């Protein structure tokens, strides 16, 4: 009784700066990207079978800056604040904001060989909290976490933390984008308008 | 013709390993049809499924649904105008359906004329079932719920928690049965029928009945 | 591979028995089959029906006189039947009592079926369709396109479902039942929803 | 692969016999099992108990009257037993003489065991737990979270160990023994310690 | 040496015919010895026998004792002065014994040194029993009680009735365990031990747990 | 009786300059990186099963500079002072401070093919002094070596010497970072607070 799809879409745009900057995204349908957010909402619950966040440049060999990515699973865990701390999470990965063009291969999902350079990490769907998570809206989750963070562990598998520094200027510079490549199992439909 | 409703004695067995297994049927809820749509919801958690189950299961810290079946049985005549609707929701936080339509989308949606579903009877009687095509009854998927083992929760304590934030519910209860009735003929409720739940639950980790919250 | 197969059964349309041979008709394409399917399918540029089944289901009393009729037209050019007489010739013609058909329920909840003779339900025969892969179309746009010339539609929609309601008992609508649609579809070539027309 | 399995046995908690049925209770999670385990495990975001065993071990004289009781609760919602009467119903209930249990030593030093009937020790049955992989939690944070509502805890900790001490001989504490914990854990998804809450 | 107390999971089985059979052991009561004699009594009725049984059996209108065994287990040292005494009474109206003597007359009288009875352990553990000669434990005769089937009664409702007139009890409860402790060394209670009850009860005619009085 | 883990973390940040600059790090848990330093301390001794130092850029194709790395094992051996000398140690390896983005693959430990370019070297755990080394704190080792260097041979397997030159400016420039990827066997636990 499952309907499963596989797809890649844009997840978020990246900017480099003079000082370090740590941000994070949840690894739940609603936030991964617009497309999925939309389709996934038509089913009550889901399960990740494969999730991959791939960084891809848009700047030039000339622009300085480095990106960093990792996964966290507690949610209550205080989000990293130093490249070092971040380098410790599962699936760490770092590179120059202009490197990673090799990861492209993952998004059009073809025949890949030279992926050494790829600035892309993958979620370990196997060691996740549970298998079936409820589809949640950023807004509703927000509220729950407003009460207490730990209320989130049963709503989301994990989150992707991102750090960006070693910038040329102390004022945002288009560096690249992060796209997500997933394979999700969706179950127990519902009118999209009812899902929270 | 019709038939007579006769419920069978509960079955309890101690499957060495800690598990005590109860299989039984109880009248879960009474139904009424009006001319305007009306949606109600029932938590598919031991405490609210049934009066007896409520008491029995209390003596066990946790449980696991093995087979849950809500069957609709009529109690009005073929002349009674009205339709019933049932479905399942899993994120207690999701909004409760409002149209016979939205409800038509949920897992195990089932619909029929208030005066039908009489075939489903065999589910409650525990007799050998015949043509269940006309039967109005749905079942929980079980194999796709958050956790396998859920904690016996009191309707009260549940509400208290769900009061802090509804999302705290997802880790306490598997799902809920959504029910809707419309296409009725009176602005004032008319005897529709009732929904009986036929379950089989595994109960573990014993605790004093009054220690359990 | 590339295909996102999904099989679901949702409410397609509510029905009202009357006494003036009334003919309606819905296109057999995503945007129109049902609300839910419309929602999801929009996220894909094209699709193909693997199995479509429109089933009628009562909600009235054992009396409430009335009959419901269903048929399929394939060339959007042909004129929608005006009389049940013509509707009866159509491919996959099915007629029945407004309160009968409770047996078809087995199609909706997916369970195994028993006796489906009393059931009021018909299906689209995917084999004799023009294209295999149709473009997802918003009825709103379809409309405009048909305004130019109906034939422009032939290549946009597999078929049309013609419904007929008569032999009732009231000058004004009387609630009779609904038509649920149980389909199996293959969706392809994703697109952001708002872009699909 | 990804898992960092570690099996160790360290002191979990020191015990004092008295004469006022005293009930304590520790969570069965890393941060609380013991000091050492707390230290290491923090470096990993989650974990799973493969085997947990709390064993009691004497340090007093062959007399020093006193009894020790151990049980496991699974829904942090349930009220901690107040009387040994309720503690005795619990899953994996174990009672014993404050100076008895010297036989359990075999569990701590890992050697092969002989007669474990005199030994005072119980184990968590990993099979009937809610999740498989729990989040590592600092009791300090757990606390706060439980302050909102205890149920928020259910998904953060496998179980709780309820201990009871009574039938002693002094109005004031008397040294009786310790409870060592022998566990086998699978640690996953590393994180810098200071970030784990 | 001693041993470790370990109680076994309850056993429940549905013996077609309406009977549900539960066999289990629970700590029934805690004991304290003083220098002056002190007699206490415990009703051998499901509600008071044990905390768990209390909850479980509530879901059944009637029951029947099949095997009731009160076993005394020590928790003090061989240096503790004191003796325990247990017996049975059947007419709740009869006066409660006052001398270690009168008590020596009742059915299944048993006596020992507060620090003994350790052998009786095997009764609670559910292990194969060895030398039970030294064991302090007695059993209800069962085959000679007023009725076979008794009504589940609430400690409260029982008392209310016994309040009108004690004799109204004979038709509500089978018997009561009489307990006495003396030969102690302090004018202030010292940890003696505790009495565990090991039963096997037949429960019939189900009822909502909260409907039962 | 061993507990063994495998992980990658940040070991140290790199800066390029107008003149040559030679620095060195010990290949002992405590110094490899924070994470390991922390966990490893809970065990009295350990053994390397695999140690790899990988350099990864963070600058731009435009920034000039070259990095150099090698291993030394005596400890008393006078640390190199010329690119040449360094080029002689085991596992030498050099490249442009902006090259090496291909080594990334080693850190997320995936499917690597195009690692020719990788600025990354590996320790020969096999020809090491002994197998089981004692966990040591930088501070305690420091003291011992204060007496005599040779006292170190029984405390540490080896050290990674690093040289950086051919810089654009005569004043530090963020070039990249060196991460360590290890697989260690830890034995004979101890309260972390006692290990020196
Ligand atoms: Ca939801
Ligand atoms: Ca509970
Ligand atoms: Ca389109
Ligand atoms: Ca944490
Ligand atoms: Ca009663
Ligand atoms: Ca050391």
From TrEMBL, chains C, D:
Ca(2+) binds at residues 75, 78, 136, 196-197. Keywords: Calcium, Capsid protein, Metal-binding, T=3 icosahedral capsid protein, Virion. The keyword Lyase does not apply. It comes from the Viruses. Residues 1-192 form the Icosahedral viral capsid protein S domain. Belongs to the icosahedral plant coat protein family. This is Capsid protein. The chain holds residues 72 to 268 of 268 of the full protein.
